[PDB]
Amino acid sequence: AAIPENGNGLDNIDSKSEFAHRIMLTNLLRLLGAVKSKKTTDTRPAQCILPLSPNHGTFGFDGLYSESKISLETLFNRWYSEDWGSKLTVCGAVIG
Amino acid sequence: AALDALTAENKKLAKQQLEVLARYLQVDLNKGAKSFIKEKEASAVLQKELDLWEAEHGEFYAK
């Protein structure tokens, strides 16, 4: 799930950009954290397929899209650092 | 001219009688108005804390 936001630069990070970042990052991690909380067994993991992007700010005015997508790459090492490794498995797909 | 002057004194007598009757019955003739004023300013307080959210976040985020 994503919002189409365009024309939003660094000087025009607006309500749509904040809400899109909320959808794409902070409640995306909340679905994963809630599925982690509703699981009781370490034998049935959920393979989260993360829509990563290969263009982290290399394009122009997209709002917080690059900020939303580069912050999903933290789950690759947060898989090791936290207690949901056997609970969620991260499989980031870099869509071209 | 003078018809309105006498109508005004008739209604003046009616008001002075209504206040005496409301005093006799211990009726707060403005309790509704005072409560409306005190709950309309509470609406102002909640609107002040509500518009903080919309100023801080925006219309799109709020909707």
Curated annotation (Swiss-Prot), chain A:
According to its UniProt entry, the function of this protein is described as: Fatty acid synthetase catalyzes the formation of long-chain fatty acids from acetyl-CoA, malonyl-CoA and NADPH. The alpha subunit contains domains for: acyl carrier protein, 3-oxoacyl-[acyl-carrier-protein] reductase, and 3-oxoacyl-[acyl-carrier-protein] synthase.
- State the family it belongs to: Belongs to the thiolase-like superfamily. Fungal fatty acid synthetase subunit alpha family.
Name this protein carries in UniProt:
Fatty acid synthase subunit alpha
Q: What is the lineage of its organism?
A: Eukaryota, Fungi, Dikarya, Ascomycota, Saccharomycotina
Q: Which organism is it from?
A: Candida albicans
| Subunit relationships | [Alpha(6)beta(6)] hexamers of two multifunctional subunits (alpha and beta).
